[PDB]
Symmetry: C3
Subunit: 455 residues, 3 copies
């Protein structure tokens, strides 16, 4: 026998129902091998990789990651790849778990407006990455051409309350993190393995705030976790919880009771979580600058009764989650669009700066700008801020130390530089502060900050 | 007892037969512990790390990786290290799996023209990296000073049809990838972990094309897989197949049925593959820019009958394998040598450009230059190419977009920039295109391209 | 049941005794669940990250890594975090192994001079990283805010002879490796994952020479191994030995008989070592430029009888361990302090250069400067050195090749450049050589070298 030796296909041909992230198709719930027809279409399109930041993604099914495919070990899969006629590039597919050269690549080569097909038997149970394998392969994967296929064991997976679909990728923009506008792919950064963004499901905030995954206290969650790369290895981790089980691809080995697990580039794992106490559980790449400086954070939000005997503490806030504690940062998108249109108002800037102030400034100056007398000076009704708004731009870009006097009190501390903030971000944060807490109002422009940065 | 407590050496002293990659010594096939005498000589020498690219390697036994050593758990090993008198540097050896300080390092210190010896008992079964441990250690490992020793279990490994020897390394050249000439080691890139090449067995194409590993449908293959580093961790992966078994060093744990496995820097694994359908199975570091932009791809070629019930698709071609689909790129070596000699002919350039055109240009313009009317413009009998050969140099270096007219048809698409191509590569590709498909002939020089790149 | 369902706390409340690295609290040795009160204080302070190199660390309990916490699965932990009033920054804590949002983060937010508390039940047995989770999280972790908590299984761990505490971190200084002075945190290098130092226990040499860990032949050692990151994954390895067992966090899976093991960023493992033969066993990150160029090396020194049947070789020396073979490099600290004070003597420079010469120069020129006639020229009574001390500065910075004559003998070899040596290091090494072996004496200044480097 080969593995997956369950006989020829029986029953009727099945048209696979594919799902967009973060959702998963229902279990196949089948005791016989089937001919499964899969139809997947490549679409090239602009999407928001961050608020006010567009990127030309190349997608399987219009999403990053691509549509989720779910079949049964021993199935015969008739794979149809279409390339939308709006595409500029040819594309193909390499599915992990396929037995045969290129995992489908040579037979699935598809020009814009064409369709290709190949047939394979799913011999190998497991969770598997699929991706484009068109020269230059790294460019296609970097632009978002990856997803997951699940080959179920014949008896199916154990029932759980929720199944979700989460995939990490590293992304390479010409511009710096959160630099606004349409950002080209940067080949130099990709070859050097120096990503500008590291993301779950193709965007900053794709799985935070009002887009969090949900479950209730007492329920079981299974997450199909992919690492599309192209280049990075994920120190994949859940903050404040533990995985009951971690199983890689279709491996025989199952690790139980771990919190931190390494997912290779092109790798995939099935993780199981039991909800015990309510709150936000953060999925991160624990290579920490990825999670906290490049976007690599997703949320599983658990609702239900607190258990003070297990955990007496509060729900996560802007101290740890920064500007992603809030439901969304839609005001940044709106302020960026208004800048492009030449219609940016003070209130556009105030609402964008309000979103960006959380964590970034609030951890020390507080959400109300009061600070802590003698320790963190106030931004609320600040005489020092009002006396010199241009000095305030320098303070954000280049930091501040030494003795100062604010509202009649001496400070002798250190505010670190925040030079990685973009000109629009500094301008919008300071406009928010000037228009809050009885401050004098007016505005700071991106152009004002550009000139102070240039020194 | 210590582990490997099999008594004193018996029988006759055995002179170990060492093998060069990718071959392995035969199984020891022995029921008693032996005194094994190992003789390994360090040689410093220039070799081709890529076509027309030389590098001064430092080698154990004249190869990268070094000669394969095969002994039995419980053996007494008398290790002789010689340093060839042509060497400039002192060398030594640290074998993983040795019980004792430095794994041999202090007692194996060997100046040019000298010999050292130390004795160790092989207590620990497993596959193990050995490497040089001479200050500065990273420089010696970076220049190729690593290989594998297998310590067999007393009963031997299970029989297989083929055993092969494959070792990844990261390499640091002063010049960029495929920049021609003798390339010095670059300490700055090595300290930053920014390799110019990531290779299997010490060269681009060492295990591709006419140097592929072979087996037949139905046969079992065991690969001894090393990661010499110095710095990178391999997302080690087989395209289009699965590993029956993966076992790290002499670990008790064996993973079964996985496709993608992380091999630490200085780590080693034994993988087992069963051949099911014919074609090329690609071994890669799935940190994808390594595999597709820095050389990290090897081939296991399976011959035998197709099974359309398991896989209906075609053998891999230049779409996925690029310029390594072909048997070899010997024309690039020959054109580089002719440039050095000042004897470079048009035909030298044409044959080199023919090799480099595969994948790099052919994925969109086709192997015959016809393109796809209205989608990818033709290079065959191209009026647009002929009208301005200098514009063609700019197009390759800097890309092209917007409306153009080629052979009476409008195109409105995007050709990405290919600025990572070296001046000789652009010149040779364009000379190939000009001398093919009824194009006007003539030639483009490396110097022509240097001037266009300088703008 | 939840896991760790051992009933309510019994007995008396226990004030946890915490230990500084590399020591561990004694086993809890308890058959009942307890209320454990933990008190940990954040201190910001300058410490030596290398000889003559200061850094402002942020610490849990005044050390990097932070104080070790030891409790029993099923314990109720009342966690008190104090922030010393000298602190400039707010801090908090996220303990892996805590069941609840942020692992403690929202409830442990603590301004300078304040205290916070939260209670959690230790449901999950294992070894776990804890760290600060205050925006910007990567900055706090990069400055040293991490350590380990052990949650014992109810029956306790198996008895061993020694338990030690070793934690890797990556560090980001504005200055280059071993550049002297107070070094600021460098956000740009941290975001790029380009550390200047990779260290065990917060400093170069923290666990080498006279600070090595100890045990005797025949004894068992358990090491609690953390990777605080923030960014790097450790190819964690013991030179010249094997781990009996490696267990990650509280995972069910235990790997036995491995030498090289990958520890994720934010991960932790318990390793077990049996001492077989005497000597220094080096713990490294086998991403080799970290271990040999950035400080990532620690020593377990085994005393006892040699066993020539297992290993005939010598103890490690400066060939493999370089300048860390010696007990300490205190002369470098003293010479750096004397430079700051403007009191640097020739003898200050000689003793610092003596420390730095080991490995760096001695591997080729020998510890006595004799070299090897015709192969490595002498530094002892060197006519070539004496004839031009300025040429000697160029040779160290930029290397030397080609035919030379030294003390009546021709050399035709290659000395690699050592441009990564700092101006003070070149000046002190050459002053050592000039004042040794009947050389003419005098001195080379850091300023002399600065001018030669500037060309
Ligand atoms: C702690 C880590 C802080 C963060 C984050 C931010 N700021 Fe700050 N800021 C902080 C200190 C300790 C000080 C005083 C420094 C000293 O020399 O003692 C400051 C100072 C300012 C000021 C000027 C003083 C005042 O008006 O109160 C301004 C205008 C200011 N900070 C603004 C500001 C903004 C907008 C922030 C986010 C972008 C921000 N700060 C972050 C401590 C900390
Ligand atoms: C697809 C990803 C392509 C690859 C790889 C290469 N080329 Fe290309 N090329 C492509 C397009 C879509 C276009 C037209 C762009 C537009 O504005 O619509 C081009 C154009 C050229 C041209 C000029 C037009 C012509 O003569 O047909 C030349 C001379 C050319 N391309 C050459 C070329 C070479 C030599 C390549 C490898 C080095 C190469 N191209 C790659 C699409 C793609
Ligand atoms: C081997 C890897 C070496 C290391 C490490 C260092 N040196 Fe060296 N040095 C070496 C060689 C082979 C040569 C001769 C090169 C040639 O062209 O043949 C040298 C030369 C020098 C010299 C000049 C000659 C002499 O006086 O003997 C000096 C002053 C010198 N080397 C000093 C030196 C110092 C101070 C080192 C550590 C910083 C050092 N060398 C390292 C080989 C090697
Ligand atoms: Cu594609
Ligand atoms: Cu793949
Ligand atoms: Cu060597
Ligand atoms: Cu090693
Ligand atoms: Cu902190
Ligand atoms: Cu953490």
């Amino acid at each position: 026998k080969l593995p997956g030796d369950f006989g020829p296909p029986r029953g009727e041909p099945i048209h696979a129902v594919l799902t967009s992230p973060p959702l998963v198709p229902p279990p196949v719930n089948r005791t016989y091998p089937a001919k499964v027809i899969v139809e997947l279409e490549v679409v090239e399109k602009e999407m928001q990789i961050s608020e006010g930041v567009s990127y030309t993604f190349w997608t399987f099914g219009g999403t990053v990651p691509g549509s989720f495919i779910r079949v049964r070990q021993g199935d015969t899969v008739e794979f149809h790849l279409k390339n939308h006629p709006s595409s500029k590039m040819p594309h193909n597919i390499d599915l992990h778990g396929v037995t045969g050269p290129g995992g489908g690549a040579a037979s699935s080569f598809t020009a814009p407006g064409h369709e290709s097909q190949f047939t394979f038997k799913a011999l190998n149970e497991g969770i598997y990455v699929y991706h484009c394998a068109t020269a230059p392969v790294g460019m296609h994967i970097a632009n978002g051409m990856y997803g997951l296929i699940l080959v179920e064991p014949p008896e199916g997976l154990p029932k759980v309350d929720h199944e979700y679909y989460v995939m990490q990728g590293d992304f390479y923009t010409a511009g710096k993190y959160r630099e606004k506008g349409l950002q080209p792919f940067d080949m130099e950064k990709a070859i050097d393995e120096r990503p500008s963004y590291v993301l779950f499901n193709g965007a900053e905030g794709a799985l935070t705030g009002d887009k969090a995954l949900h479950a209730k206290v007492g329920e079981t969650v299974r997450i199909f976790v992919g690492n599309g790369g192209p280049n990075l290895v994920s120190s994949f981790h859940v903050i404040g919880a533990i995985f009951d089980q971690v199983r890689y691809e279709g491996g025989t080995n199952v690790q139980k009771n771990v919190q931190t697990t390494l997912i290779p580039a092109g790798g995939a794992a099935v993780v199981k979580f039991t909800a015990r106490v309510p709150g936000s559980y953060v999925l991160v790449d624990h290579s920490i600058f990825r999670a906290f400086n490049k976007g690599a954070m997703a949320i599983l939000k658990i609702d239900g009764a607190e258990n003070k005997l297990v955990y007496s503490g509060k729900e996560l806030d802007s101290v740890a989650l920064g500007d992603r504690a809030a439901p969304n940062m839609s005001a940044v998108t709106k302020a960026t669009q208004a800048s492009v249109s030449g219609t940016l108002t003070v209130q556009d800037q105030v609402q964008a700066g309000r979103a960006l102030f959380a964590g970034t400034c609030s951890v020390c100056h507080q959400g109300n700008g009061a600070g802590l007398p003698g320790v963190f000076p106030p931004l609320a009704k600040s005489d020092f801020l009002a006396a010199d708004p241009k000095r305030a731009m320098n303070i954000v870009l280049h930091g501040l130390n030494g003795k100062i006097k604010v509202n009649g009190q001496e400070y002798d501390s250190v505010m670190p530089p925040m030079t990685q903030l973009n000109d629009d971000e500094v301008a919008n944060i300071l406009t928010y502060v000037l228009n809050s807490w009885d401050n004098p109002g007016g505005r700071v422009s991106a152009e004002d900050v550009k000139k102070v940065r240039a020194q």
